[PDB]
UniProtKB/Swiss-Prot annotation, chains A, B, C:
Subunit record text: The mature envelope protein (Env) consists of a homotrimer of non-covalently associated gp120-gp41 heterodimers. The resulting complex protrudes from the virus surface as a spike. There seems to be as few as 10 spikes on the average virion.
Residues modified by glycosylation: N48
UniProt name for this protein: Transmembrane protein gp41
Topology class, membrane: Single-pass type I membrane protein
Domain of life assignment: Viruses
Cell location: Virion membrane; Host cell membrane; Host endosome membrane
Known function: Acts as a class I viral fusion protein. Under the current model, the protein has at least 3 conformational states: pre-fusion native state, pre-hairpin intermediate state, and post-fusion hairpin state. During fusion of viral and target intracellular membranes, the coiled coil regions (heptad repeats) assume a trimer-of-hairpins structure, positioning the fusion peptide in close proximity to the C-terminal region of the ectodomain. The formation of this structure appears to drive apposition and subsequent fusion of viral and target cell membranes.
Source species of the chain: Human immunodeficiency virus type 1 group M subtype B (isolate LW123) (HIV-1)
Amino acid sequence: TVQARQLLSGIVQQQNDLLRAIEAQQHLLQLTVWGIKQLMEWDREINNYTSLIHSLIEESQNQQEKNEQELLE
Amino acid sequence: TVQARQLLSGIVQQQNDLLRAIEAQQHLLQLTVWGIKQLMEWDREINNYTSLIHSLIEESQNQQEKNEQELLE
Amino acid sequence: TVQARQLLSGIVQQQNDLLRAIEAQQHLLQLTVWGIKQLMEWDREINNYTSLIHSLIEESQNQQEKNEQELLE
């Protein structure tokens, strides 16, 4: 079970890796949106998807916390 | 096994979270590509990676469906 | 255990899917950063997050290799 627990712990760890990666890429995307904005329908779609992504990120964080608590029990 | 099944179900759920997050960020990236385009080698690389990412997204969706069916059995 | 091993193998496979997806999206982001740059505080934040993301990607790759080796044992 110890080796069983270790793989699962590596998988849950990798999900946190991936989520942090996604979060960092969101910061970058918002930076480019800002650059493009410094230089309509586009504004509407930017907002709708930006809203969606932050919502998806929070839910991922919540699920990450649950998975790690479940793994620990 | 019930608590075993629950962690795995949270992990598979988290992968769907992550995939949807990635998909949303793709919509955003395509929006910025569109803004930059409104304002060569760049066009070629945009197309090659855009093609790759949509292919990776579809394969991820296929694998997501399998994982969830396998979890249910 | 065979069906057990298969789900876990699909999950680890899906993490590689997701990581490759994230990597491809990084190539795209860097392309748009390049387009915006062709057309200060912005430069500093771009660099700090670009650095973070490549670091997160390498660590994800390392963890991916471990997870797959652990799965195989």
